[model samples]
Target: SMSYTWTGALITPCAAEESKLPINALSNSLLRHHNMVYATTSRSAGLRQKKVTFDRLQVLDDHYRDVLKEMKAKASTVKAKLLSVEEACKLTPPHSAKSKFGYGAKDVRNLSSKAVNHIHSVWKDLLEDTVTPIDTTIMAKNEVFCVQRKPARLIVFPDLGVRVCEKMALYDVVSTLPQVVMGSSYGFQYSPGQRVEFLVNTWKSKKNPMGFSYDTRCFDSTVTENDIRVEESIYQCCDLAPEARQAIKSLTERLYIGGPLTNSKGQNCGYRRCRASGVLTTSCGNTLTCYLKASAACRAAKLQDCTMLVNGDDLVVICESAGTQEDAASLRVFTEAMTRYSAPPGDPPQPEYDLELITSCSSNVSVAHDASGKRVYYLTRDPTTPLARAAWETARHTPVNSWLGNIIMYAPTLWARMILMTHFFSILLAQEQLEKALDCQIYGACYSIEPLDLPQIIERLHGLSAFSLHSYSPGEINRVASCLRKLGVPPLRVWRHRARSVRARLLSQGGRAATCGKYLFNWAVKTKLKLTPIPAASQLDLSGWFVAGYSGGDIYH
Candidate 1:
């Protein structure tokens, strides 16, 4: 079946869209090449459609069946519960799209009787009607970037009521099943520190490690009806309540398998015969399918001791190398097998002997020296996108600030500490919004995090070493420097001088604000403060922060 069938209807925007970066006084201080940053709008939706629409062909073998049986066996041991209407409602982000039935996310979160009643009806309907295809809104995502100029990504989601119903049925299953089925291979189960540790340990355990990241071109579009049904079969293997089972089956047939696409103007845009990017199952389904296909492909290619780390569509496999020549040949065969399974790569896979060079989840393992001269492994990425988005957020008040998240996730990195923290804290200090709670995502779940809490959050998530880390790898430093030059961001020396002033102001405030200055900006001063664990760090409830990926599942905490 085709990924999508169009109705000659246009994907129209509800309001005017901004394609170019909006600049203010702070923009040039962070990034000078404002024109290099552009946002994708609905105008590019047709081009995206052309890229994603394609026929898929899948051929399964004994290796696939063996992995399926293994997954089901692990899944059978799991018992998942159904979330109550109120529980599901609480999971919805406060700014989530409103329901067409007139209730908004605010009403849903407040447990308004009208919202609760509609959610109940939606769940009841799911149990009774399993075959009617659900309606999904298809819109192009307005995401900021530097120079890629790729067409806007499309998101397809059902009504808010139906989304709540989905949570009530599958939230527990999706949250718990992947870890059980994939075990340590489940990438979202690790925080940045733990992820680097895993990668390092896995690399050392191999005699001669050769790893590669597989980029499945349009991974969601590659999902077929058979893949959805197979995912359903895996979920059905779990121990679930009768009602929950029925709801899952109904959602599988009605929504997860495929659905109709409706534009914002209520026009019939098209029908999707592939995975809906906004569904609750989007993350779990992609993770399971990608793992299954890759695991099977590994066997088909005769790769040895393959260890996979998968987060939704992002996958990295580290396995024992059979010499350089054989490793390259094995990757080609592996790619061929994945293509036959309908997961062809956007960029062809290349074997990498160095673990730090193999990027996954848009991050790679980098090294820095701690205060004690101990080598500390932390996760870092090319700072181009993070710097660009930080510049945009510095100029504009976006709902979710990626800079804060980047600081939290990549605290130990040179770029994050020198550029992101310096730039954002300078702005927040000037505005006197240092204590203001801002929203950011970690593993795709939104959280209201305060800037002043950086000291405790960093200590808890990364460690006190995040504050004292220095002597970064040459490769990492070069990448950050090159990115700053390309994006026209100020040099690190300029940020250091600026951070000293911001640090002095923060110290004068004398509270958690002072604590942030003492810890986060310790690198700016000539003499660093003796870093210690914050007493408040132990009190933070960050249990579910790195548990799973919910990129398009409408999750919040």
Candidate 2:
């Protein structure tokens, strides 16, 4: 089936869209190349539509069946529960889209009688009607970037009532099944520090490790009806309540299978026969399918001791290497097998002998030296997108602060510590919003985190070495420097000087603000304060921060 069948209708927006970055007093201080940054609008939806629409063909072999049986066996041990209407409603983000039935997210969160009554009707309908296609809003996502003019990504989601119903049925399954089925190979189960540790240990376990990242071109579009059904079979293997089981089956046949696409203005845009990006099952389904296909491909390619780490559509496999010629040849065969399974690569996979060079989830392992001069393994990435988004967030009041997310995720990196923390903390201090809580994403789930909690958050996620880490690798430094030059960001020396002033201002205001200065900006001053673990680090409840991916599931914490 075609990924999408379109009507001659436009994907119109609700209001005016901004294509360029808005200039403010603080914008030039962080990024000078204002012209280089742009936001994607609905105008480029046509280009995105062209790229994502295509036919898919899948051929499953004995290896695919073998892995499927193994996954089902593991999945059989899981017991899932159905969330009550109140529980599901509470999971909705406060600013989530309002229902077409006159209730809003706040009302749902508060469990208003009207919202709860509507949700109950939706769930009851799901149990009774199993084949009606759910209606989904297809809108082009407006995202900020620098110079890379990719088209806006499309998001398809059902009504708020239906979404709440999805959570009631599948929330427990999506949360627990992936870890049980994939175990340590699940990427979202590990934080940044733990991820680097896993990668390092896995690399050392191999005699001669050769690794590569597989990029599936339009992975959501590649999902076929068979794949969705196979995923349903896996979920059915789990031990579930009778009502939950029926609800899952109904959702699979209706919302998860495919649906009609409506625009923001209520125009019929098209019908999608592919995975809906906004469904609750989107993350779990992608992870399972990618894992199943790659695991089978590894066996078909005759790769040895293959260890895969998957996060949704992002896949990286580290395995024992044969000779160079054999490794290269095996990758070609692997690519062929994946293509046959409907997951063709955007860039052809290449074998890498160095673990640091194999990038996954848009991050790679980098080396740095701690205060004790011992080698410390940390995660880092090219600062181009993070810096660009930081510039935008600094100027505008966005819902999610990517700068804070980057700082939390890449705390030990030279660029994040010196540049991102310094830039954002300075802005927060100036605005007198130091104690205000800002929302950011970690592993695709939305989290409302306070800026003053950076001291404890960094200590918990990245360790106390995040504050004292220095002597970064030349390759990592060069990447940051090149990104700054390309993005017209200020140099390292300028950030250091500015950090000293910001550090003083923070120190003048005592309490958590002072702790932020003491721990986060200790690198800026010549005389460094002795770093110690924050007393609150252990008390912080970070249980769900790295549990799973919920990129398009509309999940909040």
Candidate 3:
């Protein structure tokens, strides 16, 4: 009999944006801000965990603690700097938001970059510490390193850049691992699940406001709901005046915003227009918003134009394409002027890819990478014995041809997402069938028994395809969003819940970068914590959370 032993629980780290290119993409400020928040939050969580674990430390445990602590202090300082970095980042956020030449954002970005250096340094410290466990220090040895030991596993953690499109979705990880563990031992800054709910709510709107939801087997019931396999929504800030939208659209379009054409002798140049749309409206003034080339092209455009994502509406934009690269220089002047235009767009939002990832009813992932595009990462894993079984098991969970994930995903890139999903699947499928497969296929082995991270475990199979499934409010979609507002405050709210501050949000629930409201970025935090006037009491609509069955439908965690 093949004894499958669950020696210990393993983590299926969620893919961060920027792992690979071409196949995936993400916005600059999004990645930057997310990383900024995550780095600090993860460290904070780790600090809390360390306090709890100090009594549990053995020789190995203490070794882990001290090394992490030394790095922690440095990280702490960097995190502090990160908080103040909005100023520095304004100068230079990332490649996507960079400008070739012009009045820059100054040190805000550079100040913030110190945190990245600090984070990179911490990983290096983990690798350099002669005493730390061998497996724990894989990321800092080199841009890419090799760890060939018994399991013969490869540890490849990609850079979580400043874009969301560069990230991977949660569902795509189902066939990837047994229990794809998305949380980090190093303490990434995602908020607790409760907090995540709050953040997503802050962005809600009448039309297209982003949001998220889920499907799962209940804790109390044996039967689960299958008819609605997916749960999610899109949000746009639609409360703006009509003139605002038209004005911004016209201003952004043909505003002599950028410099002379680089290639075309006489014509002004910009990226071959990607797309445009009027999306959001603000409160203070008759502010209008639109979305423009929400593609990787926007990132390149930053080289010439200054990009700043200082506020919320930054995501729900007004102009479609911010024009092209050549025009970016010219466009930058207008962008800066508008920002300084008394009201500006408040804080410019982090740029995101234009296309909203949606699963077709048939479940085939639609590919969007351009062939000429060079930003792509190719991951090749060695397939042998245990690894091979793990690989097939991983693929099983994926909804064939579904959106796997985009390389530009901000949490991290595509390569990391692929590995995360597959790794999770191997473990998940193995555990699901267990004895029959291992006993029959492998020569000899008994499985170990232990409770794996349920979410992570399900990820290994890759239920989500090329595009990651983000957070969505299932019932909220069917009902008036105002109803969603009322349902939440009753139970958790010590006081009244404010609806205006809550914007709807969408994020992956599984995979490496996927954190089920467990860290800082969780929707809840975005809502409650980030709100200027913190709501007296607010939370996610709970009606759908508990009651589930088809008609009785339960909220899957």
Candidate 4:
């Protein structure tokens, strides 16, 4: 157990020799199940010493040319009309930050004269001034690391008007272009099941497949002025409206190139040295450029049968292993190519000796027991981020409920099923909003998710087998335990005790809630409840839900 006080501007450790969870009623319940837990505090500051410049790079290849051509064709087919101010305003969430121009989201939603006028003014400024960078706010996001507690991640986001401008300019392009070019490699196209299936197929395609995840140190910060300009060039290939083209180019020159950084107190902190994390284009820009950079790098390094699966910065590569020594040599060459392209590796690229142990997108395949005690392979993460967001949600209303998103994405995992579903379901239940639709994202696209639809959502996202998964990995179990302690969430055993009542209440409702009960609580049943198919999910496109700055809400508003 340790604690400390902040004495400097740096985001770093408090008193940390493995920080302990706060002694609370919920943590005490978790402590009963876990022997020990540790927390690590971390911070982000300073600029990259070796900043990348994009002036000399040439990435257009047969593959690049091919993708670009396809992207243009798809863009031509897209008859994207400009969304009206009223329509766009309605797209904004109920809780968007108030504008300094003296209007807020509610005003915009209600089509208040001041709000509409302010939005038009902002839009006009964006078109007229192409070179003036937008100002952004930088803050330390409080999170808990399993190795310590109170980790501070530096988060930078642009002002609200700039975000709206970005939406007007680039939203359509981002929503449609990546999928046209990358196809299945476009990340957002698949659920966890599809991702694994794609990976397994790619691995089996090679006789000896090696896999690894490459980390770019401060990925958003590492993006250079030239990178932004290069991304703008891609947007040019699309058939955008005359106004959109001008606005987008201006946005690239101003906001994307660099921006003014303001601290929490509203004082100008510094000039942004690189990509602003808060912009609407951030995710799509990173994904497009990262794919371009890595694809070219792979070609340069001569990786045979090389295939990659990327979710923005989260990437996994599977290729024929040319033995240990040669693979290491190729990695160094790959790293060099990436650096020259401005996407430098934060750590040396890891070479997986066994593909099964490889993790991507913070998820790895692991064994878990089923309700019948049979071991099953499933995708899982540490649940640290989800737990942190859960804690935040528990305390107050967040822009996006991460626990809900995790419950959708990692619905099969023990931590997600027992802890996340149990906690959030209980809350939604108490609030009498179990059937109320809430938005959560998957693969950068938004969906209106209902707590009443958990069974259907879980089944569709994770598969029907999610209900049966058991035999949790020791690492996974440990993570769940620590997460519960750190977040002050109830333990799995307690959730089990409550799930019965939760399930029974839902079942008694005799409607959608009953369907949720049967699927979510299938394990609690003697005769496992018959699962119902959700045709609505199949009909939904579920794409283009990408929000800027990823705070879990609508960015357009």
Those runs of model 4 whose alpha carbons end farther than 4 Å from true positions after fitting are 1-81, 149-151, 367-377, 388-392, 395-397, 427-433, 436-448, 470-495, 532-557
TM-score between model 1 and native: 0.99
Tell me the tens digit of each residue's lDDT in model 3 across 439-557: 11000111111122222322221212212322222322222223213222111121111111121111232432232112212222333321121121123222322111111000011
In the order shown, the candidates' Cα RMSDs to the true structure are 0.9, 0.8, 27.9, 6.2
Pairs clashing in candidate 1? none
| Model 1, span 1-557: residue lDDT tens | 89999998988887799888998888888888888998899999999999999999999889889999999999999999999999999999998999999799999999999999999999999989999988999988888899958889999999999999989999899999999999999999987878888999999999888999999999999999999999999999999999999999999999999989999999999899999999888999999999999999999999998899999999999999999999999999999999998999999999998888988989988888888999998999999888878877877788788999999999999998998898888888888888789999888788999888888988877778989999998899898999988988889999999999989999999989899889999999988788877999999889888778887898989
> Candidate 2 vs candidate 3: which has greater lDDT?
2
**Deviation in angstroms for 11 in model 4?**
11
Residue 262's lDDT in candidate 2: 97
Off by over 4 Å in 1: none
- Lowest summed lDDT across 10 adjacent residues in model 4 is found at 1-10
lDDT of 4 at 331: 85
Instruction: Give per-residue CA lDDT, model 4, range 139-158, as digits (tens).
Output: 55444344343334455666
Candidate 1's displacement at residue 362, Å, is 0.4
User: lDDT (CA) for every model shown?
Assistant: 0.91, 0.91, 0.20, 0.65
lDDT of 2 at 395: 76
- List model 2 lDDT by residue over 439-502, tens digit each: 9888777899998999999998888998999888999999999999998888999999999988
lDDT (0-100) at residue 215 of candidate 3? 13
